[PDB]
Every structure is written in C-alpha cells, then in structure tokens.
C-alpha cells in the first residue's frame, strides 16, 4: 500500500482530499497521490479504463484502510495558474485554439463512454511543458457528488455550471461540459472570467444578463424546470462582439454554439472538432 510512496510535497487540495508529488519506490515514477479521508469503489476503477492522451491518466487506485488513494501521473502545472501568469500579456491565440481543441478531444472520448466529467475549471485542466493539456478528475462527481464546500470548506466554485445544473436539473447529458469549457475559452481569451457568480442565483443572472433571459422560444421546457421562477427579470441578449472581443468571427461562433441554452441545441464536442475555428489550428511550445 502507501508504504511504496514517498510524499515529496503538497501540490493541492481537491473537494475531497489533498494532493500530493511523491515517488513510487518500486517503479521510481513520480506521481500526483490524492488521499481521501472516509458503489465508489467500482465506479473509480471503471476510470482506470478509460485512457486517453488528453485525460489526465489514473495510474492506480489503492484501498487500504478507511482511506481510497487515487494515484494520477504528474503535470507541471493547471491551467489557471498560466493563466494568472498571462494575466499581462495573455495566451497566444494559437495556443489557446490547441487548448481548446485538446480539451474538446478529451471531451468527446469521454463523452462517447458516456462518462461526464461535470465541474469542469481551469484547476482541473493540467498541462506540460511540451503544449499538451488534460483534463483531471474525471468522473469523480458521479460518485460522491459536487459539494458546496471543499473538505477545508473552501467555496466549491460555480462559475463555469451549466444553466441546466442551476435550474434543477438531476438528470444533465454531457452537454454540462462544452457549456463548461465555454466559459473557459472565453475566460483564455478575455482574460477575465466570464460569469463570475457568487451564489447559484448570482450566477443564474449573470448568465440571463449577458445572454438573455431564456424562454420557451430558445430553450423548450425551460419553464417547468425546477428551479425556473417566472418571477426571473426579463433581460436582453448581447452580441459576442462585446462578450468576447477581439476574437474572430469563427471563434464566435463556435463560442455561441457551445453557450447555447437547450441541451439539445449545445455544440457536442465531436461536432464542436469539425469547426471551422480549427481549420489552422496547431500546437505551439508554451512559455511556462
Ligand atoms: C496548485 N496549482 S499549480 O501549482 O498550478 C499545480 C497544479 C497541478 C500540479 N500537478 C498535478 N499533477 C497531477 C494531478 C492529478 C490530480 C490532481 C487532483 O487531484 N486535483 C484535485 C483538485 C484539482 C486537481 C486536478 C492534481 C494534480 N496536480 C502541479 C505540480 C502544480
């Protein structure tokens, strides 16, 4: 068990547990070990499966004890660190549009086993030196479900759910994550985020404030959802020229697509790889 580790240092603190570097002794890998203090145990080793160059790969679940320890190949750094880092300058275009277009085959590899990921943030998209970036935490919300704090109570995060996960909805599709990435590819490319909300209503209007008010015209059964209130202020949509300046009129569109209100109507995440957005997408070395 956790005798063949050797923690170097903390590199982070999950909802569930804190993340560790540390040294396998038998095989010298370095690795991210995330302990968690205590249908989970089966639904975790079904992600061991579920291999991919843009996932963050599950090298091991190890259960000893009232502890589940989850041990995950390493990366450098997240997402929101760079960029904080960028903060002055900002993400180059070409490599925001490799970001994306890695995430979105991520996402549509998942999404074709039918695993969502479900809190999708800047914290959890993990990259390399090399230009590569994964996503990490994979599935690990259908099992214990996404708290409101952290187990050190910090605040779990709200600014990149789904519309559909603020209205009530229990039973969401994979669509949840392109809305999620949405919001992050907005946030590269501004430089600031894109609904920052501080409370599930807070986030519900900032969303409505910027694109409109959902109705039954552009959103079919919106009305009967849960949480949906006719009380809700009535507020016009804007165009993306000033969500999102200066980008382009592709990355517009498909930033549209992947913000749409229904469900059914969001861009999937294979048909989101198609856009003409990547028509000259590459991948360049970052400056980290
Ligand atoms: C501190 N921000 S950093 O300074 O830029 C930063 C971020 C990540 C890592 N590397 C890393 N590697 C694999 C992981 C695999 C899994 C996890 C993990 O359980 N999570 C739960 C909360 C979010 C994260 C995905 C973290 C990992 N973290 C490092 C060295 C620095």
Redesign the pocket.
Known sequence: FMENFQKVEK??E?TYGV?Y?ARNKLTGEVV?L?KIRLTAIREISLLKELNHPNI?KLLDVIHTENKLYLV???????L??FMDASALTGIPLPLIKSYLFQLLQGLAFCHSHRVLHRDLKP??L?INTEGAIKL??FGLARAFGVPVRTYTHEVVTLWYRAPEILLGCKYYSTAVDIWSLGCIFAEMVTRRALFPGDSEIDQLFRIFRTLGTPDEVVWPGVTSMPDYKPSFPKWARQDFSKVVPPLDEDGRSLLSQMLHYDPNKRISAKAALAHPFFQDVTKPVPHL
């Open positions: 590199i982070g999950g993340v570097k991210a995330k963050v995950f190949e390493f990366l450098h750094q997240d929101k660190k914290q959890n993990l990490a935490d």
